[PDB]
């Protein structure tokens, strides 16, 4: 089956610029059965370009189609920010129809510094027979962080999960939360719980703990 | 507006039959077509699964065509999709797509889409709430933080508010994660100045529709 | 006395499809419509431009005969002024038609063990058929604005499908053989008369 490979994974720009994304193929496809789509996270995808040259009804006149044979590309005229979403390509020409990987577009800003706020377990949770340690990171632009817990200077891993939110509508930052799920069997023994924060913006690695 | 109505959500056991419908008005012209796509959380689209009303001809993918089947009906104009032998890797949203077509000529691309249908494969349970009292060591002066932790709930139509709904700013609700047992657990926080601490005393408000529980 | 040939027409071994119907011109014989062996499976009888009571007193020049096999719930489309798929893409009669339409059940011959696939009918076409026209083209149909290049795909389909005749079915899916007769009369030495 024909496979599609979109090269640009992420492409950060500024509002009022030009971006160019491509969606190539392995074999040769016919330039009459190619289609582009646009999808906002939490909605249903819609059609943007059909036939690789024609636009759909209602679509503004800033999405231009180009490319033929084996290489296709989509050009943006003027980034008036309402379209920082994921784009896909499809090839409905052969019998097995495939899609693409995905290209997300984000907004560029200055590198900020995250804030650390640690929280010890709750009394009602201990009375119920469970425990959890949360370390919150707020207001950081670079979506590439790493948190390594220090439980009595013993490198722990595995029993930890992280959830990240999307960009805001005011400054386009991120927030990261991380929980440390453990039972009371290991809570009455260990008491030192550090949250090592290592980020590109933070020159000195900040570390908070408690007892 | 020309749209495609779909079915509601449904939860099933690990191994059973499931049926999702897609009703529309353009499906009675002997030339209409409709495909089926699937998107998981984060993962991109999956497959084609198309069918032509009239000279009924199916064409499935490689991983499928052993447990999936697609049927058509021109009387009511409703398509169908069945998937048997369900495992715990099919929890995703299913979409319906079809082009605008007359009685003699169709379009040249997929224009109309649908809404989506959520399918989950697990057991059932009841929600719970736990406090996250503010720590006095994390305060740096006029900048504090606090929240509430939610654990042990199977369905996820969960909504969280603050100050009895009399608050809009400073809210950062994180999405939910799936634990090893099978129950979800999200978390939410609020950023209020430390000067307001010791002066503004409040709690958090949550809600779960299939259980009707609020704290 | 030199009867008209109607034995091989009504008692043939195998008929044809609806898009490739046959046409036989009967002439130089006496119209003796009393030896049809009553067409045992209760044949119907409907005439539009002629009367069944007194019709043997008219001498026609040429009489055409058409034969095909259609389904049960589509015999009502063989009539002047009828719309559908077998009345617009396969076979159509004019507005002023003189003749009769005959049809009887053939569920004991056009059916075999669990599936019989040897009868086709056209489903897609560009425009409607004019009266008395036969098309045997097996090209591809475009339903969009892009060329097909001779390969089935998204907006390019095939205009022929089967019928799936099976013994166990309803009274609206069994095959029915239809024979259409058309009478012709012009300034010629007409020789096709009745028993007289």
Numbering used by the authors:
A (entry chain L): 1 to 211
B (entry chain H): 1 to 215
C (entry chain A): 333 to 528
Question: What does the report in the manuscript say about this coordinate set?
Answer:
In this study, we reported the isolation of potent and broadly neutralizing mAbs from a vaccinated donor with a special five-dose COVID-19 vaccination schedule. One mAb, named PW5-570, displayed the most potent neutralizing activity against all SARS-CoV-2 strains prior to BA.5 variant, and another three mAbs, named PW5-4, PW5-5, and PW5-535 were found to broadly neutralize all sarbecoviruses tested, including all the current SARS-CoV-2 variants, SARS-CoV, Pangolin-GD, RaTG13, WIV-1, and SHC014. Cryo-EM analysis demonstrates that these antibodies have diverse neutralization mechanisms, such as disassembling spike trimers, or binding to RBM or SD1 to affect ACE2 binding.
